[PDB]
Design a protein that fits this description.
part of a larger assembly; 3 chains; A mainly alpha (153); B alpha+beta (110); C alpha+beta (61); A: 153 residues; mainly alpha; 50s Ribosomal Protein L17, Chain: A; C: 61 residues; alpha+beta; two-stranded antiparallel sheet; 2 helices; 2 strands; 25% helix; 20% strand; elongated; binds guanosine-5'-monophosphate; binds magnesium ion; binds zinc ion; RNA-binding; zinc (chain B); structural constituent of ribosome (chain B); metal-binding (chain B); ribosomal protein (chain B); mitochondrion (chain B)
Chain lengths: 153, 110, 61
Amino acid sequence: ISHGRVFRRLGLGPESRIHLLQNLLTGLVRHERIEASWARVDELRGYAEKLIDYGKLGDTNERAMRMADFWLTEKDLIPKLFQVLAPRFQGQNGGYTRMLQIPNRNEQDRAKMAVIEYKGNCLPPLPLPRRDSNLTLLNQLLQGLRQDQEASS
Amino acid sequence: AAPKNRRSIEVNRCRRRNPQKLIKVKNNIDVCPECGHLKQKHILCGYCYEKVRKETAEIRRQMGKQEGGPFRAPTTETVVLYSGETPSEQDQGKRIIERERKRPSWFTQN
Amino acid sequence: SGPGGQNVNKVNSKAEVRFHLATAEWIAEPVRQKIAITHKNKINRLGELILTSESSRYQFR
RNA sequence: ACCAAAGCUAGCUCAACAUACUAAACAAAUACAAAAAUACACCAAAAUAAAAUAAAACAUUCACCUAACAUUAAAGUAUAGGA
RNA sequence: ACGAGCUACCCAUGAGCAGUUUAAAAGAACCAACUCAUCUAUGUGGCAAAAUAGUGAGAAGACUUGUAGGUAGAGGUGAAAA
RNA sequence: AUGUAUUUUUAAGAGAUAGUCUAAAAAGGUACAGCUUUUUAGAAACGGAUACAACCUUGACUAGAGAGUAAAAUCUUAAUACU
RNA sequence: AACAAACUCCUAGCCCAAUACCGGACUAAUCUAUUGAAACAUAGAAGCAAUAAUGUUAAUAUGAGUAACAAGAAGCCUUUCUCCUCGCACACGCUUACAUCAGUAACUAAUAAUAUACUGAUAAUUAACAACCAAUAAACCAAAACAACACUAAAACGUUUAUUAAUUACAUUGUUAACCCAACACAGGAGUGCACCAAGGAAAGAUUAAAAGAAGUAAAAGGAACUCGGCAAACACAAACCCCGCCUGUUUACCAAAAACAUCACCUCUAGCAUUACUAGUAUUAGAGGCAAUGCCUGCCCAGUGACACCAGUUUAACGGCCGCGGUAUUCUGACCGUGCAAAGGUAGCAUAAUCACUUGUUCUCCAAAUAAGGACUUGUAUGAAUGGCCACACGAGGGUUUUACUGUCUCUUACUUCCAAUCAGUGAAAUUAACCUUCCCGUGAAGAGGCGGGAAUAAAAAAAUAAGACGAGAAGACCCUAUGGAGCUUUAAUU
RNA sequence: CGAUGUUGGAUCAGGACACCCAAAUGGUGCAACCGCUAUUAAAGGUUCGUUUGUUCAACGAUUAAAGUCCUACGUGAUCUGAGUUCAGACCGGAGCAAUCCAGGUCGGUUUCUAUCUAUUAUAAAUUUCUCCCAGUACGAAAGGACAAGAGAAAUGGGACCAACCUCACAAACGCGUCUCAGAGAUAAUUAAUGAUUUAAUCUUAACCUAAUUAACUCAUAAUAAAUCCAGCCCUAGAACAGGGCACA
Ligand SMILES: Nc1nc2c(ncn2[C@@H]2O[C@H](COP(=O)(O)O)[C@@H](O)[C@H]2O)c(=O)[nH]1
Ligand SMILES: [Mg+2]
Ligand SMILES: [Mg+2]
Ligand SMILES: [Mg+2]
Ligand SMILES: [Mg+2]
Ligand SMILES: [Mg+2]
Ligand SMILES: [Mg+2]
Ligand SMILES: [Mg+2]
Ligand SMILES: [Mg+2]
Ligand SMILES: [Mg+2]
Ligand SMILES: [Mg+2]
Ligand SMILES: [Mg+2]
Ligand SMILES: [Mg+2]
Ligand SMILES: [Mg+2]
Ligand SMILES: [Mg+2]
Ligand SMILES: [Mg+2]
Ligand SMILES: [Mg+2]
Ligand SMILES: [Mg+2]
Ligand SMILES: [Mg+2]
Ligand SMILES: [Mg+2]
Ligand SMILES: [Mg+2]
Ligand SMILES: [Mg+2]
Ligand SMILES: [Mg+2]
Ligand SMILES: [Mg+2]
Ligand SMILES: [Mg+2]
Ligand SMILES: [Mg+2]
Ligand SMILES: [Mg+2]
Ligand SMILES: [Mg+2]
Ligand SMILES: [Mg+2]
Ligand SMILES: [Mg+2]
Ligand SMILES: [Mg+2]
Ligand SMILES: [Mg+2]
Ligand SMILES: [Mg+2]
Ligand SMILES: [Mg+2]
Ligand SMILES: [Mg+2]
Ligand SMILES: [Mg+2]
Ligand SMILES: [Mg+2]
Ligand SMILES: [Mg+2]
Ligand SMILES: [Mg+2]
Ligand SMILES: [Mg+2]
Ligand SMILES: [Mg+2]
Ligand SMILES: [Mg+2]
Ligand SMILES: [Mg+2]
Ligand SMILES: [Mg+2]
Ligand SMILES: [Mg+2]
Ligand SMILES: [Mg+2]
Ligand SMILES: [Mg+2]
Ligand SMILES: [Mg+2]
Ligand SMILES: [Mg+2]
Ligand SMILES: [Mg+2]
Ligand SMILES: [Mg+2]
Ligand SMILES: [Mg+2]
Ligand SMILES: [Mg+2]
Ligand SMILES: [Mg+2]
Ligand SMILES: [Mg+2]
Ligand SMILES: [Mg+2]
Ligand SMILES: [Mg+2]
Ligand SMILES: [Mg+2]
Ligand SMILES: [Mg+2]
Ligand SMILES: [Mg+2]
Ligand SMILES: [Mg+2]
Ligand SMILES: [Mg+2]
Ligand SMILES: [Mg+2]
Ligand SMILES: [Mg+2]
Ligand SMILES: [Mg+2]
Ligand SMILES: [Mg+2]
Ligand SMILES: [Mg+2]
Ligand SMILES: [Mg+2]
Ligand SMILES: [Mg+2]
Ligand SMILES: [Mg+2]
Ligand SMILES: [Mg+2]
Ligand SMILES: [Mg+2]
Ligand SMILES: [Mg+2]
Ligand SMILES: [Mg+2]
Ligand SMILES: [Mg+2]
Ligand SMILES: [Mg+2]
Ligand SMILES: [Mg+2]
Ligand SMILES: [Mg+2]
Ligand SMILES: [Mg+2]
Ligand SMILES: [Mg+2]
Ligand SMILES: [Mg+2]
Ligand SMILES: [Mg+2]
Ligand SMILES: [Mg+2]
Ligand SMILES: [Mg+2]
Ligand SMILES: [Mg+2]
Ligand SMILES: [Mg+2]
Ligand SMILES: [Mg+2]
Ligand SMILES: [Mg+2]
Ligand SMILES: [Mg+2]
Ligand SMILES: [Mg+2]
Ligand SMILES: [Mg+2]
Ligand SMILES: [Mg+2]
Ligand SMILES: [Mg+2]
Ligand SMILES: [Mg+2]
Ligand SMILES: [Mg+2]
Ligand SMILES: [Mg+2]
Ligand SMILES: [Mg+2]
Ligand SMILES: [Mg+2]
Ligand SMILES: [Mg+2]
Ligand SMILES: [Mg+2]
Ligand SMILES: [Mg+2]
Ligand SMILES: [Mg+2]
Ligand SMILES: [Mg+2]
Ligand SMILES: [Mg+2]
Ligand SMILES: [Mg+2]
Ligand SMILES: [Mg+2]
Ligand SMILES: [Mg+2]
Ligand SMILES: [Mg+2]
Ligand SMILES: [Mg+2]
Ligand SMILES: [Mg+2]
Ligand SMILES: [Mg+2]
Ligand SMILES: [Mg+2]
Ligand SMILES: [Mg+2]
Ligand SMILES: [Mg+2]
Ligand SMILES: [Mg+2]
Ligand SMILES: [Mg+2]
Ligand SMILES: [Mg+2]
Ligand SMILES: [Mg+2]
Ligand SMILES: [Mg+2]
Ligand SMILES: [Mg+2]
Ligand SMILES: [Mg+2]
Ligand SMILES: [Mg+2]
Ligand SMILES: [Mg+2]
Ligand SMILES: [Mg+2]
Ligand SMILES: [Mg+2]
Ligand SMILES: [Mg+2]
Ligand SMILES: [Mg+2]
Ligand SMILES: [Mg+2]
Ligand SMILES: [Mg+2]
Ligand SMILES: [Mg+2]
Ligand SMILES: [Mg+2]
Ligand SMILES: [Mg+2]
Ligand SMILES: [Zn+2]
């Protein structure tokens, strides 16, 4: 019975799971885009979302200061977090990270792998799944429906 | 416990040829509109992702060559440009990476 | 109880004779009182006297 | 259709003859803890064969059982045997 | 015939026992290294043809242990468990 | 006597000598055993007693897509008024 | 009536069942002598025919793609983060498994990546550390333990003098390693000097978070009510009463660590002595033994069997034994007596015991309840005094009984993690197996049926669990009996 | 005997009735309550502790009751090992000794990865205790009812976290909370009507009869709209399945 559980079991326990997530978060903050197992990236998504929120509280906030000190193992990333990631995420509310499932690892384990990336980074854009153009048959019929609806009012 | 009798080939075939054990056909297979290679509808294209990953690896190698130390991370934003490009007014004041390769078609200025 | 292996394990060879003393008309009254006095440890509260045998291996013995 | 199956050869065995019987190689080192050139010693020795078995047990007995006299008969005879 | 390189006991040559209470190096006391293996749980074709974890006893002595040698089966050796 | 052809010796011989039930005559036990010990007879179907070792019918070869028979298939009552 | 056989007729025949044993006629496949040469005939020979020996060898199947095994994360590609701490060298031992380059389709890593563990080629360990590195006579009792000076158990470790010791660079050998013994790259076994990290490494291949299992943490009220036992666990880790052994210690490597053995102490016996034990010792000694410190003691007996005495006689701290029958004081008993046999007739002590059965002997304390425990009574007619009897301090992973404290032992379990478990990828065993197209009930039957009989049930295949059955698997029952089968041990067995 | 693993317990229990209670009755030396026997009825239960390895047995407190058996005197490929049933060691006895004990004491390895059969949740309650009935009927008084109706609980079935408690996850869990039923039918046993046997007689004589146990069936309750299923969540789940993805 695992009803109402949000945290999946990783590593050698709760503390090892926290340490693994901390290492993943440090790597994500340092490189602005990392890849891991799908479950690990899925769990790290929320922590990365909350880290930007904490950084948006300001540099002088002691709680956010100690949170960054604990999480960002490499101490040169804390100034980066508070002066690059936080300032560039100001008008955005919760659209800080993007997660996409990549093909399985070429190793024999054939793990389900995902890539997480902070938006607005200085990296080549991933092959995002783009929707069809409005000039398609179905979308053009839908545009006709929309035009009729607009003309009806 | 030990088996009582040897299981015949009829039983063995009926056991290990059941549709539950057979590999199911995947009907989410599609071709990538960009490169024409095969990909799944919910999974990013392997070819394009490999291109992006190699470009990212080269960019990161250059930006780490810029920083001679392990704990020397930029405190400002970063911008990468290719041969034949100049930083704009909105791109100045940031750390700059310069590449000898020309700008790829998929990589947009922005 | 005792060492007899499977024999003692699964053979009913312990004998027990239990009978009421007050209504036992086959024993004289003074004798009944004397037994009730001297062997009160072997008599329970319902007046039933109990004797048991375990020594012999045979049930009839 | 996989897994597979089939070759005829290497060679062995039993005898006979036979010179007469520990093959070849032995440059160096070889019983120092072998293949280790080189210092005052010790070197050496012999004393019955036994039993597993048979006698339906087992005590006396039980051929052959790592000692030349071979073959045809005498003869499985005289004898020796808890006879 | 071959076996004391494991083990039982000796023979030469060496090496170990930190800290604490004690006039004590007292076949004393607590507890380490170290040596044994009381109890339980796993293990039972296992890590292992006798182990792991927890927990236990001794821990300056009739103590452990390294090297070399000896006692060989009708026997050796044995603080007798045949 | 009669109906049948078997019996006795001669010369080679091996197996077996660790057995069950039924009917009958007895003994022991408990006038008990799918009990044990003696004597007479029988059996050990591919049919019957639903299944079945011993109970019954049956002088056991082969082919038939012929026939006649044998032992054998639901066993009996369930009843007591006397004003 | 009918239906109903290995019975009997009908139509043709090659014209009557069978275990052990017995007889006969043929015959499969080889070699040889003659025929034959699209593979046969007559004769003579045998290594002359396999559905069966828990048969031997080789390959294969079921169990089974099951149990089981591994690589910390990100990355700019070997750089940074998260954790645990058996590391360096020498001795012994293994021999190149060490280093560089190149390759891994396959072979080795229990899987990949690649490579200290596979393949090929080329190089290497350079002595000052270590091995080999004087004899012959004489002076020499006086410990090592910071050694001042002492104890008993009396203690390895050295110089000087005198005679000869080739005399003259550079000799020979071990120098790698991730390693040794355990069938394995095994959670095991391994001596010594240093420090507890300044050196070594990674518990997780990736997911989900079913049952059951192992490990850990926490728990309302109760606080041993669970159980053979307070085994395990616990915020406690204390005080006591008995049995057995005085105590430290040793023992059945691999089911028994003890109440067993040994032990200081006490007793016996056997020896008046010299060059290998005893012993380089001499009865206050040395062996063969018993019982166990200490305290109270060890009562009777040489009738039997041993030993000295070669016969008498002595020995029990030698092997061992220490009584009946009947009546009696005033009722229970018997101080006492008569008689008989003995070598003496069981003394002291203790006592329902670790002590045959009766036994849960009787009684008191402990508990609400006790075949438990302790204290008393005691013929125990089978207790008993060095095969030792009684108490006592200390002691004991020995065996029993209580008082609190303690707690998931339990009332009555629950929650969460890790290893497990299920899914994906890789590698991939074992016992077992006559063939199974492998149901339930009743009856039957070599006397407990999935296979028979009479009835019910019945699309076929997976995956995960529980173990009622397959008289389940494992070991030609270790209990019992037989074998004119063994072996150990003891003798009053028989030959010696 | 080329193995059918052997006592007590832990867990789970299947069945028989020769019934302990619970239910319906008959006779009583049954006035009433306690009682003693006899018939029918097996859907459900049949306690907690001390001593003993104990089955038994003795005792304490209760209960409506602490039933008798079969089941390899059930169940060790589920468990326990205290005793029995190996090898060690004592005490008493036998044997000169080795050894012997249904004579006692301590200690003493309990293996299995499931091949096949089999199986892996629909319900439609039960029983005690209090108030009246009533100190009423019944009785010389002491004593003392049945039935009917109101409630409290306990067991068991099925469920759930508003609060308490376990609880450092949003959940799970009990020690916490909610619910639990109508009709027919009968066995034993009572009377109406009525012949054989013009009386009577409940009838293996008919007709309709009425009071009637437990079971057992049935009303009733649950599921009960087929072919979209890539991906993402789930109070749904081993895998497979199942419910959601328009508000926001
Ligand atoms: N002594 C003996 N034994 C026989 C006889 N017949 C058959 N047997 C035995 O019976 C057994 C076989 O039974 P059957 O096959 O005869 O039914 C075998 O032990 C066989 O020796 C006979 O006539 N005499
Ligand atoms: Mg007993
Ligand atoms: Mg015994
Ligand atoms: Mg016995
Ligand atoms: Mg019996
Ligand atoms: Mg013989
Ligand atoms: Mg013979
Ligand atoms: Mg013999
Ligand atoms: Mg001979
Ligand atoms: Mg003569
Ligand atoms: Mg030696
Ligand atoms: Mg040695
Ligand atoms: Mg010390
Ligand atoms: Mg000490
Ligand atoms: Mg251990
Ligand atoms: Mg623990
Ligand atoms: Mg200690
Ligand atoms: Mg001590
Ligand atoms: Mg001998
Ligand atoms: Mg000997
Ligand atoms: Mg002994
Ligand atoms: Mg012995
Ligand atoms: Mg004959
Ligand atoms: Mg015979
Ligand atoms: Mg018979
Ligand atoms: Mg006959
Ligand atoms: Mg038949
Ligand atoms: Mg006939
Ligand atoms: Mg016919
Ligand atoms: Mg004819
Ligand atoms: Mg015929
Ligand atoms: Mg021929
Ligand atoms: Mg042959
Ligand atoms: Mg063959
Ligand atoms: Mg064979
Ligand atoms: Mg396979
Ligand atoms: Mg399986
Ligand atoms: Mg597994
Ligand atoms: Mg790992
Ligand atoms: Mg080697
Ligand atoms: Mg490989
Ligand atoms: Mg190599
Ligand atoms: Mg080195
Ligand atoms: Mg995991
Ligand atoms: Mg793993
Ligand atoms: Mg679990
Ligand atoms: Mg647990
Ligand atoms: Mg705890
Ligand atoms: Mg609690
Ligand atoms: Mg108790
Ligand atoms: Mg109890
Ligand atoms: Mg404990
Ligand atoms: Mg304690
Ligand atoms: Mg305590
Ligand atoms: Mg006692
Ligand atoms: Mg002791
Ligand atoms: Mg002392
Ligand atoms: Mg010893
Ligand atoms: Mg030992
Ligand atoms: Mg042992
Ligand atoms: Mg011990
Ligand atoms: Mg032990
Ligand atoms: Mg002793
Ligand atoms: Mg004295
Ligand atoms: Mg003494
Ligand atoms: Mg004496
Ligand atoms: Mg004498
Ligand atoms: Mg004399
Ligand atoms: Mg006394
Ligand atoms: Mg005493
Ligand atoms: Mg005493
Ligand atoms: Mg006694
Ligand atoms: Mg006891
Ligand atoms: Mg107790
Ligand atoms: Mg007592
Ligand atoms: Mg006592
Ligand atoms: Mg005596
Ligand atoms: Mg004695
Ligand atoms: Mg004596
Ligand atoms: Mg003794
Ligand atoms: Mg001890
Ligand atoms: Mg003690
Ligand atoms: Mg000790
Ligand atoms: Mg909880
Ligand atoms: Mg797999
Ligand atoms: Mg086999
Ligand atoms: Mg079938
Ligand atoms: Mg048959
Ligand atoms: Mg049979
Ligand atoms: Mg049957
Ligand atoms: Mg059938
Ligand atoms: Mg049938
Ligand atoms: Mg029927
Ligand atoms: Mg089963
Ligand atoms: Mg069968
Ligand atoms: Mg079996
Ligand atoms: Mg046998
Ligand atoms: Mg046995
Ligand atoms: Mg025997
Ligand atoms: Mg015989
Ligand atoms: Mg013999
Ligand atoms: Mg013999
Ligand atoms: Mg004699
Ligand atoms: Mg048997
Ligand atoms: Mg068998
Ligand atoms: Mg068998
Ligand atoms: Mg069985
Ligand atoms: Mg039941
Ligand atoms: Mg009845
Ligand atoms: Mg009743
Ligand atoms: Mg019942
Ligand atoms: Mg049995
Ligand atoms: Mg019986
Ligand atoms: Mg029976
Ligand atoms: Mg049983
Ligand atoms: Mg049992
Ligand atoms: Mg088991
Ligand atoms: Mg079983
Ligand atoms: Mg035991
Ligand atoms: Mg004693
Ligand atoms: Mg005994
Ligand atoms: Mg015992
Ligand atoms: Mg013990
Ligand atoms: Mg299965
Ligand atoms: Mg299982
Ligand atoms: Mg009154
Ligand atoms: Mg009432
Ligand atoms: Mg309830
Ligand atoms: Mg009338
Ligand atoms: Mg009337
Ligand atoms: Mg219905
Ligand atoms: Mg759906
Ligand atoms: Zn593409």
